[PDB]
Amino acid sequence: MREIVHIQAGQCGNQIGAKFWEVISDEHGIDPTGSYHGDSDLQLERINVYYNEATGNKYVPRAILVDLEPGTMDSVRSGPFGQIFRPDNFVFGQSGAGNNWAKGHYTEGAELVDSVLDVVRKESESCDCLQGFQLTHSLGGGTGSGMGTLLISKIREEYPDRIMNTFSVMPSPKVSDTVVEPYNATLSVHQLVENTDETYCIDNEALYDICFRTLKLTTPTYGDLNHLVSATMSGVTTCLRFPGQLNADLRKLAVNMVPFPRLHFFMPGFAPLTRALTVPELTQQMFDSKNMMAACDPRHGRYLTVAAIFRGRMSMKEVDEQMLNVQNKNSSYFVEWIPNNVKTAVCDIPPRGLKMSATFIGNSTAIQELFKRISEQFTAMFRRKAFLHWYTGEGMDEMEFTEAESNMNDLVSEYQQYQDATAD
Amino acid sequence: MRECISIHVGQAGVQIGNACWELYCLEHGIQPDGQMPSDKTIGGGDDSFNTFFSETGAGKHVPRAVFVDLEPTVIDEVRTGTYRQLFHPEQLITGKEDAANNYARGHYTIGKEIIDLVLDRIRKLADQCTGLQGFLVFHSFGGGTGSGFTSLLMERLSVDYGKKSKLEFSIYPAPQVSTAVVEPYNSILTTHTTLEHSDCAFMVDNEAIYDICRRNLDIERPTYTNLNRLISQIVSSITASLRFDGALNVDLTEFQTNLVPYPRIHFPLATYAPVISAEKAYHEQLSVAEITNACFEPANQMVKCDPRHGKYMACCLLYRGDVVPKDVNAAIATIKTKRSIQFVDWCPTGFKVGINYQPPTVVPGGDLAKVQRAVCMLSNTTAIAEAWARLDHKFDLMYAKRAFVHWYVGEGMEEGEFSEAREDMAALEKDYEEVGVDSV
Amino acid sequence: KREHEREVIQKAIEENNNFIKMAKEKLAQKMESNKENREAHLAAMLERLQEKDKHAEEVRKNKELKE
Numbered sequence: 001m002r003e004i005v006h007i008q009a010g011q012c013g014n015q016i017g018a019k020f021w022e023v024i025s026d027e028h029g030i031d032p033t034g035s036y037h038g039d040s041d042l043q044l045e046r047i048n049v050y051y052n053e054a055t056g057n058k059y060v061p062r063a064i065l066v067d068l069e070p071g072t073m074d075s076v077r078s079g080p081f082g083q084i085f086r087p088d089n090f091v092f093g094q095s096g097a098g099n100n101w102a103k104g105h106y107t108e109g110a111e112l113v114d115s116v117l118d119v120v121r122k123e124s125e126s127c128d129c130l131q132g133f134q135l136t137h138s139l140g141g142g143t144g145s146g147m148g149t150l151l152i153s154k155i156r157e158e159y160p161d162r163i164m165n166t167f168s169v170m171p172s173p174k175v176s177d178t179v180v181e182p183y184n185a186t187l188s189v190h191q192l193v194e195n196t197d198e199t200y201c202i203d204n205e206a207l208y209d210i211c212f213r214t215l216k217l218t219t220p221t222y223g224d225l226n227h228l229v230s231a232t233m234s235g236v237t238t239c240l241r242f243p244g245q246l247n248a249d250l251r252k253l254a255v256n257m258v259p260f261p262r263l264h265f266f267m268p269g270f271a272p273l274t275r276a277l278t279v280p281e282l283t284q285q286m287f288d289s290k291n292m293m294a295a296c297d298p299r300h301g302r303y304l305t306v307a308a309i310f311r312g313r314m315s316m317k318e319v320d321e322q323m324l325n326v327q328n329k330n331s332s333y334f335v336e337w338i339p340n341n342v343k344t345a346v347c348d349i350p351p352r353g354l355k356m357s358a359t360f361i362g363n364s365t366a367i368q369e370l371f372k373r374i375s376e377q378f379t380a381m382f383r384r385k386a387f388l389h390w391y392t393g394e395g396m397d398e399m400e401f402t403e404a405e406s407n408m409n410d411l412v413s414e415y416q417q418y419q420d421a422t423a424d
Numbered sequence: 425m426r427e428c429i430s431i432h433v434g435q436a437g438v439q440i441g442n443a444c445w446e447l448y449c450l451e452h453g454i455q456p457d458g459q460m461p462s463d464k465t466i467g468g469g470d471d472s473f474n475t476f477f478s479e480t481g482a483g484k485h486v487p488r489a490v491f492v493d494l495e496p497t498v499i500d501e502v503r504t505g506t507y508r509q510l511f512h513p514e515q516l517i518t519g520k521e522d523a524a525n526n527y528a529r530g531h532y533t534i535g536k537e538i539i540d541l542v543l544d545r546i547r548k549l550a551d552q553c554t555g556l557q558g559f560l561v562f563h564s565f566g567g568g569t570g571s572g573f574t575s576l577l578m579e580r581l582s583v584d585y586g587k588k589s590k591l592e593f594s595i596y597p598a599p600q601v602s603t604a605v606v607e608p609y610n611s612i613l614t615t616h617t618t619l620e621h622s623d624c625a626f627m628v629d630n631e632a633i634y635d636i637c638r639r640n641l642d643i644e645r646p647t648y649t650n651l652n653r654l655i656s657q658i659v660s661s662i663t664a665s666l667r668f669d670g671a672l673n674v675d676l677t678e679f680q681t682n683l684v685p686y687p688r689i690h691f692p693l694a695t696y697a698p699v700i701s702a703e704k705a706y707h708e709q710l711s712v713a714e715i716t717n718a719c720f721e722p723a724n725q726m727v728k729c730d731p732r733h734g735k736y737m738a739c740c741l742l743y744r745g746d747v748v749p750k751d752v753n754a755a756i757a758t759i760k761t762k763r764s765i766q767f768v769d770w771c772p773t774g775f776k777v778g779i780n781y782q783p784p785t786v787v788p789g790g791d792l793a794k795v796q797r798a799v800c801m802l803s804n805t806t807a808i809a810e811a812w813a814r815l816d817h818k819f820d821l822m823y824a825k826r827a828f829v830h831w832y833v834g835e836g837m838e839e840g841e842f843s844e845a846r847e848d849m850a851a852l853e854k855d856y857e858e859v860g861v862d863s864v
Numbered sequence: 865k866r867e868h869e870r871e872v873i874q875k876a877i878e879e880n881n882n883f884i885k886m887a888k889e890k891l892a893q894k895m896e897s898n899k900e901n902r903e904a905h906l907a908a909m910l911e912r913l914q915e916k917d918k919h920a921e922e923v924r925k926n927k928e929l930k931e
C-alpha cells in the first residue's frame with residue numbers, strides 16, 4: 001500500500017477538510033462509524049491510501065486536525081462523520097492566531113507544532129510505504145496560513161523525500177474583508193514556493209463568482225463555496241483513490257505536472273457545475289474559464305501541463321477524440337516545447353448525484369493573474385507600511401515582508417518567461 | 425540444452441509476459457497447473473519446448489522466467505491469477521515503491537535496492553540449464569522501471585554472464601496510451617545505456633499496434649489486453665523456431681546472423697500477418713501469397729516507418745502452419761517484381777525463410793481469428809531510424825528548456841548523462857545513414 | 865601457425881574479460897557519482913530548512929527583547 005497522511009489546519013482547513021472526508025467516505029462506502037457497506041469491490045481496492053483499517057473491520061481516516069483554538073474542531077466532532085476521526089489526532093491550543101500569520105508560524109504555532117509532529121510521526125510510522133502529505137488550509141487566516149506553512153517545513157525536514165501536497169484557499173475581498181489577508185497570503189506563498197511539490201489553488205474569488213454569476217445564487221454561503229471545493233477535491237484525488245494507470249500516486253502526478261520545481265501551482269476545474277451532459281459538453285466546459293476554481297483566464301496564458309479526469313460510464317473513444325479536438329483547435333494555448341503534455345484518466349465510478357463528470361487540473365502560466373491580484377493588494381498596504389505592528393511585534397522585521405513580496409514577484413515573471421518561450 | 429531465460433521488467437514487460445506465457449501454454453498443451461499430458465518423459469527432457477520450460481519430478485512444466493517490478497500490484501495479479509500455479513513464488517519479484525516514471529529512480533534510487541535479489545533469482549534459473557543460450561528481456565521504454573531498471577539489469581548481466589546473448593522486446597511509446605510526459609527522456613536514456621549490452625532488440629511501437637487493433641480488428645478503443653495479445657502472437661512467431669522442431673525449421677540465431685551486420689545495427693523491423701477478426705476470416709482462406717504480400721504493407725509493421733523510403737540489409741520470413749516452400753518461393757518472386765524492395769549493395773538480396781508446421785493458436789475470448797497459416801517478417805531496414813528521429817525530436821524540444829530535468833538531477837543524475845545519451849542517439853542515426861550509402 | 869592459433873584464442877578471452885571489466889568499472893563509478901549527488905541534494909535541502917529554524921529563533925528572541 002502507498003499511504004497518504006492528511007492534515008487540516010485552521011478554521012477553513014478543518015471545514016473543507018471535513019467535507020472532503022464526508023464526500024470520499026460516501027464514495028468508498030464507509031459510514032460515520034467507520035464501517036463499510038458498499039456495493040463495489042472497487043471501493044476497497046485502494047482504500048488504504050486514505051484510511052487505516054482498525055480491528056472490527058473499522059476504517060479510520062489517516063487524518064490530523066489542527067488549530068490554535070478549540071472551537072472549530074468541536075463543530076467537526078459534532079458534525080456528521082465527526083466520530084469517525086481518531087480522538088488522539090485532535091490537536092488544538094487555546095490562545096489562537098487571530099488572523100496573524102506571525103503568531104501561527106513563529107509564536108503560538110511554534111509552541112504547538114511539536115505536539116502535531118508527534119501525531120504525524122505516529123501515523124507515518126504505521127505506513128507500509130508512505131507516499132507523502134496533503135494539507136488543507138486557507139492563506140488568509142493566521143493559523144492555517146502561518147502554522148500550516150510551518151508544519152510543511154517541519155514535516156519536510158523529517159521526510160525530505162516524500163511528496164508535499166496542499167489545498168490552498170486564496171483570499172478574496174468579495175468573501176472576506178479581514179484586510180490583513182493579503183499579508184498572510186503573500187507570506188504563505190513565499191513558503192509554498194520553496195517547500196511544496198504541488199499546490200491546488202482554491203480561489204475564493206473564483207468560488208464566489210461561480211456561485212453568484214453561474215449558479216445564480218445571490219448571497220452565497222461558505223456551504224456553497226465548500227460544496228465546489230469538496231467536489232473539486234474529490235475529483236483531483238480520484239486517480240489516487242481508485243484503480244488506474246495514469247497519475248495513480250502523488251509523485252507520478254508531480255512528474256507529469258511540474259516541469260520546473262517552483263512552477264507547481266495548479267488551476268483546478270470541474271464540470272458540470274451544480275439532463276446529463278455529453279462528452280463533448282463535459283470536455284468544452286472543463287476547459288472553460290467559467291469552470292475554473294482559480295480566477296484566471298487560461299486564454300490569457302499557455303498550458304505547460306494538464307491532467308484531465310472523466311468519471312462515469314461513457315465512451316472512451318469519444319473522450320479521446322474530444323481531448324484531441326480540444327488541443328488541436330487550441331494549439332496556440334499549449335506550449336510546443338512540451339510534447340503530449342495533456343494526460344487523460346477515466347474512472348467508471350461517478351461522484352454522488354452525477355451520472356458523469358470531468359475534473360480539470362491545469363498548470364497554466366495564466367495563474368500569474370491570481371498572484372498579481374494578491375501582490376497588488378499586498379503592495380497597496382506595504383508601501384504605506386500599514387498594519388505591520390501585528391507582525392513586527394511578534395519578532396518579524398520588514399526584511400521578511402520584502403523578500404516574500406519579491407519572491408512572489410519572481411514567480412510571476414518566471415511564468416511569463418516560459419509563457420513567452422518558443423521552440424525556434 | 426539451449427535454454428532461454430525470459431526476464432519481464434515493469435508493468436508493460438510483466439503484462440506482456442502474462443500474455444506470452446499463456447499463449448505458450450496453449451501452443452504446447454500445458455495446463456494452468458503446469459501439467460502436460462502429452463509429455464511422457466517425467467522430471468525432464470531434451471524436447472524443443474524445454475528451451476522455455478523446465479520440469480519438476482511431479483510433472484510440472486515451469487517457465488524459465490523471472491518477473492520483476494518496483495511495485496507489487498501488477499505482479500500480484502499474476503500471484504493470484506489463473507496461472508498462479510505455473511510460477512514458483514521466487515520467480516515473481518516485487519518492491520513497494522515504483523520508479524514514478526523516472527529513469528533515475530529505476531536505475532539508481534529504487535533499483536539498486538532490489539538488483540542483487542533479482543540477479544540471485546536469475547542465477548538460480550541459470551543453474552538449472554545445461555546449455556544456456558541467452559536472455560529475452562521484455563520492458564517498456566517510457567516507464568521508470570522499464571527504462572531505468574532494465575538498463576541496470578542489462579549492465580549487470582553483461583558482467584555476470586559476459587557476452588552471452590541478450591535479446592530485447594522493447595515497448596516504444598505512443599500518445600494514445602502513454603502515462604508520462606518524460607517518456608522521451610526515459611527512452612533516450614535507456615537506449616544509450618543498453619545499446620552496448622544488447623545483441624538484438626525488437627522494438628514494438630504501441631501506436632502501430634494500437635492502429636492495427638482499430639483498423640484490422642475493429643476495436644474502437646484498444647486496451648493493453650488487446651495490444652498484448654497481438655504482441656504475444658508476434659513474440660510467439662519469433663520464438664517458435666526455438667520451441668518447436670521441424671524439417672523446414674530455421675533457428676532464430678540463424679536469422680540473427682543475417683539481421684545484425686554490425687553490433688549497433690541490431691534493431692529488426694517486425695511485420696506480422698494476417699491480423700483479422702473471426703467475422704472476416706470466415707469463408708476467407710488467406711493463402712501464402714496473400715499473407716506474404718501483407719508483410720510489405722507498412723500498415724502491418726510493428727514500428728511506424730517507411731521501408732519503401734529506405735534500404736534493406738536483410739529480409740527474413742518466419743512462417744508457421746500449413747506452408748510449403750513451393751508456394752513461398754512463388755510468392756516471393758511476385759513480390760520482388762511488384763514491391764519497392766531496394767537492398768544495399770554490400771548484402772545479398774535473397775529472403776531467409778523458415779517454416780514451423782504447428783499452426784497459430786489463439787487465446788479463448790480473444791480478438792484474433794484462428795488461421796491455418798501466419799507469417800512474421802523480420803527485416804533490417806534503414807527506415808527503422810525514423811523511430812529514433814521522432815523520439816529524438818521530442819527529447820530536444822523539452823531538453824532545450826531543461827523541462828522536468830530537475831526530477832532526474834534530484835535523484836543524483838547529471839545533465840551530462842542527458843547530452844551524452846542524446847549524442848549517442850545522434851551517432852546511431854548517422855550509423856544508419858552510412859550503412860545505406862552505396863559502396864565507393 | 866600453432867602460435868597464431870594460441871594468440872587468437874587468447875585475444876578472444878582477453879577482449880571478453882576486458883568487456884566485463886570495463887562494464888563493471890563504469891557501473892561502479894556511475895553508482896558512486898549518483899550516490900554523492902543525491903546525498904548532496906538532500907544535504908542542501910535540509911541545510912536550507914535548518915536556516916529557517918535558526919531564523920525562527922532570531923524572531924522569537926527578537927520578540928522578548930522588544931518587550
Ligand SMILES: C=C1C[C@@H]2CC[C@@]34C[C@H]5O[C@H]6[C@@H](O3)[C@H]3O[C@H](CC[C@@H]3O[C@H]6[C@H]5O4)CC(=O)C[C@@H]3[C@@H](OC)[C@@H](C[C@H](O)CN)O[C@H]3C[C@H]3O[C@@H](CC[C@@H]1O2)C[C@@H](C)C3=C
Nearest residue numbers: 011012141173174175176177178208219220221222223225
Ligand atoms: C459576516 C459573517 C459572519 C460569518 C464570518 C465567518 C468567517 C469565517 C472565517 O473567515 C473570515 C471571514 O468569515 C471574515 O468575514 C468578515 C468578517 C471577519 C470574518 O473572519 C474570518 C472567519 O469568520 C465579514 C465578511 O467578509 C462578510 C462578507 C462581506 O463581504 C465582504 C459582506 C458584505 C460587506 O458587508 C460589505 N462591505 O458580505 C459577506 C459575504 C460572505 O458572507 C458569509 C456569511 C456571513 C459571515 O459569516 C458567507 C460568505 C461565503 C460570503 C459570501
Ligand SMILES: Nc1nc2c(ncn2[C@@H]2O[C@H](COP(=O)(O)OP(=O)(O)OP(=O)(O)O)[C@@H](O)[C@H]2O)c(=O)[nH]1
Nearest residue numbers: 434435436439522523524525564567568569570601
Ligand atoms: N503494449 C503495452 N504497453 C504497456 C503496457 N503497460 C504499460 N505500457 C506502456 O509502457 C509505458 C509506461 O511504462 P510502464 O511499463 O507502465 O512503467 P514501469 O515499467 O512499471 O515503471 P514505473 O511504473 O515508472 O516504476 C507507457 O508507454 C505504456 O503505454 C502493456 O501492458 N502493454
Ligand SMILES: Nc1nc2c(ncn2[C@@H]2O[C@H](COP(=O)(O)OP(=O)(O)O)[C@@H](O)[C@H]2O)c(=O)[nH]1
Nearest residue numbers: 010011012015138140141142143144176222225
Ligand atoms: N471556501 C472557504 N473559505 C473559508 C472557509 N472558512 C474560512 N475561509 C476563508 O479563510 C480566510 C480566513 O482564514 P481562517 O481559516 O478563518 O483563519 P485560520 O483559522 O487562522 O486558518 C478567509 O479569507 C475566508 O474567506 C470555508 O469554510 N470555506
Ligand SMILES: [Ca+2]
Nearest residue numbers: 463465468469
Ligand atoms: Ca519431459
Ligand SMILES: [Ca+2]
Nearest residue numbers: 641642643644
Ligand atoms: Ca465500429
Ligand SMILES: [Mg+2]
Nearest residue numbers: 434435522569
Ligand atoms: Mg509501474
